[PDB]
Amino acid sequence: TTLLNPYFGEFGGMYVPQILMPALNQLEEAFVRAQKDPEFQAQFADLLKNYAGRPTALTKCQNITAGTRTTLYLKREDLLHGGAHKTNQVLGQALLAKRMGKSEIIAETGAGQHGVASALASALLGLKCRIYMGAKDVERQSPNVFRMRLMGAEVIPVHSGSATLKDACNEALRDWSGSYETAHYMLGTAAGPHPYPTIVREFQRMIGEETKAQILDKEGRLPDAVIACVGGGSNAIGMFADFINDTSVGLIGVEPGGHGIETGEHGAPLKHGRVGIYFGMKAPMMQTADGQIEESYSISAGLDFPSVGPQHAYLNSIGRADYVSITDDEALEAFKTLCRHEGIIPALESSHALAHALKMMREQPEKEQLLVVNLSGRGDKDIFTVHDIL
Amino acid sequence: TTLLNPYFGEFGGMYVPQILMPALNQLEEAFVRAQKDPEFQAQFADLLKNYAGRPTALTKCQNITAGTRTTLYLKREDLLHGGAHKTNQVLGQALLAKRMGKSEIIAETGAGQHGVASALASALLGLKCRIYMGAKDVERQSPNVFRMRLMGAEVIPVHSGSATLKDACNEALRDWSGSYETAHYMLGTAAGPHPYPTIVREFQRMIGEETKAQILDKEGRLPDAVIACVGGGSNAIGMFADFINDTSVGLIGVEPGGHGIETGEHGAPLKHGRVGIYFGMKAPMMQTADGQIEESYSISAGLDFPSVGPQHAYLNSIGRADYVSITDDEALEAFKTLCRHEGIIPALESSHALAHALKMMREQPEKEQLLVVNLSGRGDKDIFTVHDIL
Amino acid sequence: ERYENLFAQLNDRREGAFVPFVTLGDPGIEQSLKIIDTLIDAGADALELGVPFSDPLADGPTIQNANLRAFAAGVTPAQCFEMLALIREKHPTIPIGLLMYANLVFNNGIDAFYARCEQVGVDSVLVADVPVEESAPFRQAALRHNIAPIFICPPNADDDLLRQVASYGRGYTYLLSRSGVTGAENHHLIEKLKEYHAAPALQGFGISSPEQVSAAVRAGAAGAISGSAIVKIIEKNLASPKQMLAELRSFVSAMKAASR
Amino acid sequence: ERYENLFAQLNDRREGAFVPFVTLGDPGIEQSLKIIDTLIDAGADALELGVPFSDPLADGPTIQNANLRAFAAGVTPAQCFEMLALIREKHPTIPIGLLMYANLVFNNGIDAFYARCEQVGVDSVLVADVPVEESAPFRQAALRHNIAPIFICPPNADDDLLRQVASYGRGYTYLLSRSGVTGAENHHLIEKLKEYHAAPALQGFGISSPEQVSAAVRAGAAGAISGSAIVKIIEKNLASPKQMLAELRSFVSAMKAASR
Ligand SMILES: O=P(O)(O)OCCCc1c[nH]c2ccc(F)cc12
Ligand SMILES: O=P(O)(O)OCCCc1c[nH]c2ccc(F)cc12
Ligand SMILES: *Cc1c(COP(=O)(O)O)cnc(C)c1O
Ligand SMILES: *Cc1c(COP(=O)(O)O)cnc(C)c1O
Ligand code: NA
Ligand code: NA
């Protein structure tokens, strides 16, 4: 038995080899006590504030919405140490690891951002960091790899399977099944076996709590909708969490549509995949008709998770949240538009969220709406990519 | 005559062609009134807070100083929108430009960071941006150039002279001498003709004001010394300003020593150059025995200004502030050390400041000292550079 | 049924069971079927067969490569069930157990997967990524179709788990010799399992030498499962089918010999 | 002295002064001296000579290139003063004005630069980046060494500036025809300057056509200065010294002719 519910409706669970259950049970228990431990919270908040840079600003866009009745605010997680929202949760999981007496950290990474965040939190807190990365990604993410090494993290390429993120996720679990005693698996998104979906959300929840207080302060009211891209689901659920009970606030998740849904080359498992059991959870995913797991495709490398967090699949099923997709080209246009009119280079990941807000505005220009887009990260990393395409 | 003193002791002045004096006088006057205008301040502070990310954190280093009696804090300007402290001042100069009815912006840039900051402030405030860059730098700063273009700024290469920063500074003044009526010259450092040294300092002054309140809060006392690298002098004077009257606080400026002072290949004009008249000011600079201006050399491209701000030359002469140098290798070691023990990638520029703090600590480990280093920027931009060297 | 029978017989002959594991379709369909016929001829008491899955997270390199070779051969779950039927048609009494990953079982409906196992003649199913806590739907479907749901007893097993594995499992109990994943180059439980009337224990993971089989049986286990050690012989002889079967016969006979 | 004399003479002959400007040492020492002798022979009333500086921020492309050519020739300030002496030795009466940038004057001491100008026979010095507000040290040093400190009267000049330029300047007043920098392809003041007893005005910047000289004199100016237009002839004939001098003679004579 567990202390917390491992399922969100029919999605979730703990589908891991029997050998790992005690590790999972130990983690849930450590999390539940840390959550009630004032000393743990003070420590977490201290690092978020004095080391990461929280609270991040909530910027009102004054040029981009000209000529419409849309007021758009951007939650600036791009201003967080590391350049992305991932930093919030790895700092918490690292404190959790220490609380359990663990001295090593295992992490999986695709685009490399989670790897970098895991490495920086480890270096800061004196933990040994082991990072698994698909050989194909290692090759395409040379900069992030050097960054990880520079921070003392060990980067191990994974040549098995497709040699991408899903294969790195496999290797991390394999490693952990044998080293759970001294090492902690720092999962990178709000997915996987319980209690990770729950832990990662609670450690990303300050994004939505800050936004709410910030919008209430600047506009005297809650937004009509908050929008966030969904790769695995952490930045999105982090933004959604505090608004879930405010039924008047729309929650919109944007999955990458790649070259277009109809082309089959996308990364939108939540709305265009099929429920399966993988990576320790029951959730919708990219899989063949045979049940073999497939990769997610997108112009932005950071939305490569072939599945999605269970709480999202759940929020969708009960109609609390809506999920849409945005193609590469639409994300590109949103990327260019923000650079040119607001002087902010957004991550191609976050551009998917921005592109949808832009669409809501443009399709109904006279509609009065207060929107908040979660700018999950900065796009310096995407400069060359957008360069060549252009 | 002018409203403010154009000189700091014997350094400073307004050594520009006669045709530009009225532009200078108009700017000083606009600055003096803006400085007294509550509406202007509210606007400036608003942008700094909700758009740039101020106040930046003051991080206590807990690993790097282990085994010594040195307490080291880092002022995180690396967490500022844009990744560097330059953002603070360009936002203010942009508001100044609008206040004067100017609609265009002229800027010079070497490493490209000032160009990027000028471009982002222009895009945000609806100003047309023209940026001059030495052809040699354009070539070596491909990423920053694309960033500038991406933000709608015009980047014009300068093939004259050495085709580096000093030549770009020349072209900007040439351009301005003929377009001062509709355009404003957004100088990138606390140097040049009055009132730029004064304006840039006042627009960077929040760095030191924040630090003081932050240190007083965390340590209950003022630091023993605050340290900052000096390329042209803006991040340094921004940090120093608020502490100048607190005589118990040491002010230390670090110029790049390149391959070593004795090799002649450095960028430390303040302590190893000779007073000359150039770029509209009387200050120490890199020049031949003949009086021809020379380039500053350093592993970090952002410390390429062949001279130094006049207030620094002045603070040094009266012994209020001390200036030292740090070689490429020392900056490199400091760069690696911060990545590995604190999980922060510093700009190679800021690493010069860090390297000196490290030296103060290491040379006298039992000396009790409270130090603050101004982490002027992040080093993502330096990853490949440090890569190859390594 | 088939497990009960096999175990009754082995007990009378005072010997342990040797169970080889191979991936269906490795290195190809025709060669895989030949490999399997050789394993049985050489002395295997039962078979543990894996269905090629894209993300075998409980498997070490050796078997990860076996899956790749299988996929490279165009092998699909449907083709596996075809092989499974042909194998059963040739060997009516040997117990056949499948080593599965959850998605391949869940894919087209849980009950439908077991119904297919039943009609093909499969005896047991071990779902590697389904712990006892999440097994309800799986074991019930297995029972409804007369398939034995196999459960893993890990070394870090506490009493509660022991009791569950004992009452939920059937056919045999998979006993983990260590933590980690499958890999050739890598008692209190046995007694407690017996105490709780658990199905005969078969030890697995790392069993590559004949003496390991002797020791397993001596420790109280009904037999041993060996996979990577067998699969390694396949990969090392890819270029020569003949030598592959010869070496397979030799290894298997030596391993079964040790079970007596 | 030399300016006073030149201007007295020109007034009697009812003509304006034509003053060419070239960079000392462009394209080389020997050729530069020849170019200068040709300018005088062709009709120049005075010379405005630039000393190659590394950062000529008040200069357009044409002259920026002249400095480069000079540096490429190894020309230094010391060599310029050597040329300056040879030129004076050959032409005892022509006024010689130097176009300088502040650092080259400040370098080894302000007073020392003017002392050297005096001993070499230089008549005036125009420091391009020193406005009247910062000129105290410079004009005083100039006066002490009998050198005329030249000041620029820009088009956006207000009355106060006018009065200062009038009382501080000597020899001649440099009148800016426009804002911006030097470049060939690019009255109220004149009266006020006369009212305030300013030294004879010489208009400069953009003067490249003979009619421009006529118009300048007609407007009330004592003459015109032309630089880029002259330097352009040098760069365009680099490969042929002979044609360079020929074309220089032609342009200069045409320009001086227009001053009458
Ligand atoms: O000889 P070895 O170590 O390859 O064991 C193979 C055992 C059979 C086996 C193959 N794949 C597995 C995945 C999970 C599991 F519990 C058991 C197995
Ligand atoms: O013909 P043109 O436009 O090249 O003018 C040349 C005038 C002489 C000249 C050469 N360099 C200068 C720098 C400043 C200044 F006030 C005047 C000059
Ligand atoms: C990691 C990342 C994402 C995707 O992860 P989620 O878990 O879906 O939040 C999105 N944006 C940025 C900038 C990221 O780094
Ligand atoms: C521009 C820059 C500097 C140098 O400029 P100063 O005017 O000397 O402050 C130093 N550090 C960083 C990161 C910079 O971008
Ligand atoms: Na996904
Ligand atoms: Na400098």
What does this structure look like?
Chains C, D: It comes from Salmonella typhimurium (strain LT2 / SGSC1412 / ATCC 700720). Chains C, D: Pathway: Amino-acid biosynthesis; L-tryptophan biosynthesis; L-tryptophan from chorismate: step 5/5. Chains C, D: One of its GO terms (molecular function) is tryptophan synthase activity. Chains C, D: This is Tryptophan synthase alpha chain. Chains C, D: The alpha subunit is responsible for the aldol cleavage of indoleglycerol phosphate to indole and glyceraldehyde 3-phosphate. The complex is a heterotetramer, with 2 copies of chain A (390 residues) and 2 copies of chain C (260 residues). Chain A folds into 2 domains: 8-52 and 86-204, Rossmann fold, CATH 3.40.50; 53-85 and 205-390, Rossmann fold (3-Layer(aba) Sandwich). Chain A has 15 helices and 14 strands. Chain A has helices at residues 21-36, 38-52, 86-99, 113-125, 135-140, 142-150, 165-179, 196-202, 206-219, 234-240, 269-272, 310-317, 328-342, 348-363, 383-389; strands at 7-8, 11-15, 58-60, 70-76, 104-109, 128-134, 154-158, 183-185, 225-229, 250-258, 274-278, 280-285, 322-327, 369-375. The N and C termini of chain A lie far apart (54 Å). In chain A, strands 3-4-14-9-10-13 form a 6-stranded mixed sheet, with helices on both faces. Chain A has a 4-stranded antiparallel sheet with strand order 1-2-12-11. A 4-stranded parallel sheet of chain A has the order 7-6-5-8, with helices on both faces. With 390 residues, chain A is an alpha/beta fold. Chain C has 260 residues and is of the alpha/beta class. Chain C has a single domain, classed as TIM Barrel, CATH 3.20.20.70. Chain C has helices at 2-12, 29-41, 61-72, 77-90, 102-106, 110-120, 136-144, 159-168, 188-195, 210-219, 228-236, 241-257; strands at residues 17-23, 47-50, 96-100, 124-127, 148-150, 152-153, 173-176, 201-204, 223-226. In chain C, helix 9 (188-195) links the parallel strand 7 and strand 8 (201-204). The chains are: A alpha/beta (390), C alpha/beta (260). Chains B and D meet through strand 2, helix 7 and strand 11 of B and helix 3, helix 5 and strand 6 of D. One sodium ion is lined by residues 231-232, 267, 269, 296, 305, 307-308 of chain A.
